[PDB]
């Protein structure tokens, strides 16, 4: 046969002559490459699919089958099509081979491709939600998650965005939602906070000062809380910390 490579997004095509008989003792390699992201669909009619028979072993000798990576499709021989006229390669490059053995004289096969966006399935929420929530996510689709109330992105904010690759893989499956860790307490020269069990949200704090040498100048200040804001703050002085005075 000796085709060339087929770039195109859709195609056809058939036991050469088709439907003339599949020369009999040669090998048919067909190519196609799609766009990294996009599985070969093959759909092919049955009654377009005439293959001289296997043997009482069920051997086929006239082969007709498909390489998609490690997957094979196939072996396929007969009268009349043996699988689903529907095939989903989950490849972007397939390869088809049609071996031919003896007395041809069988119409042949001919089958048609479409290339069909391979989904970055579901990753169930946590803490958060993604937009837009849809039933089925695909190649090239993007996604703003958002974590809630009380939660944030690590390596970083409350909201990211990731779209489906071409391994159908969401894009930073890495980041998730914590709870928001406004960290450890800053400490204040001669003044003393005494550490929590949780720098987590919703954690209150109380910084003190060194009695009776040093004192307040707060005006009802020293407790603090964690916020969203990923910070210690005071009702009063906020996100900055005490004065300890004589």
């Given at each position: 046969?000796?085709g ?14 088709y439907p ?5 003792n040669?090998?048919?390699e067909?190519?196609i ?9 093959v759909?092919?009619r049955?009654?377009?699919?005439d293959?001289?028979?296997a ?14 990576g490690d ?5 396929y ?5 043996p699988?689903p006229?529907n095939?989903?390669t ?9 071996q031919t ?6 119409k042949?096969?001919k089958?048609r491709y479409h290339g069909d966006?391979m ?10 939600v ?8 695909v190649?090239?689709?993007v996604?703003?998650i ?12 409350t ?7 071409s391994?159908g893989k969401?894009?930073?499956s890495?980041?998730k939602?914590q709870?928001?860790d406004?960290g450890?307490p800053?400490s204040?020269?001669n003044?003393?906070?005494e550490?929590?069990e ?21 005006g009802?200040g ?8 990923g ?11 005490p004065k300890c005075?004589?």
């Amino acid at each position: 046969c000796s085709g060339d490579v087929f770039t195109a997004l859709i195609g056809e095509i058939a036991s050469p002559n088709y439907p003339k008989p599949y020369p009999e003792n040669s090998r048919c390699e067909y190519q196609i490459r799609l766009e990294k992201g996009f599985q070969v669909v093959v759909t092919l009619r049955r009654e377009d699919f005439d293959v001289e028979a296997a043997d009482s072993a069920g051997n086929c000798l006239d082969s007709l089958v498909f390489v998609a990576g490690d997957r094979q499709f196939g072996p396929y021989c007969g009268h009349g099509f043996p699988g689903p006229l529907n095939i989903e390669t989950k490849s972007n490059a397939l390869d088809i081979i049609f071996q031919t053995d003896l007395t041809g004289q069988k119409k042949g096969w001919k089958l048609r491709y479409h290339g069909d966006p391979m989904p970055c399935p579901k990753e169930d929420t946590p803490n958060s939600v993604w937009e837009p929530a849809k039933a089925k996510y695909v190649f090239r689709d993007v996604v703003q998650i958002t974590c809630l109330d009380g939660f944030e992105v690590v390596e970083g904010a409350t909201s990211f965005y990731s779209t489906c690759q071409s391994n159908g893989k969401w894009s930073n499956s890495k980041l998730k939602c914590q709870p928001v860790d406004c960290g450890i307490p800053e400490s204040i020269e001669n003044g003393k906070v005494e550490d929590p069990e949780s720098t987590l949200f919703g954690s209150v704090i109380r910084y003190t000062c060194e009695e009776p040498y040093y004192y307040m100048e707060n005006g009802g200040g020293g407790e603090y809380h964690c916020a969203g804001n990923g910070s210690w703050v005071n009702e009063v002085l906020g996100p900055e910390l005490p004065k300890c005075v004589p």
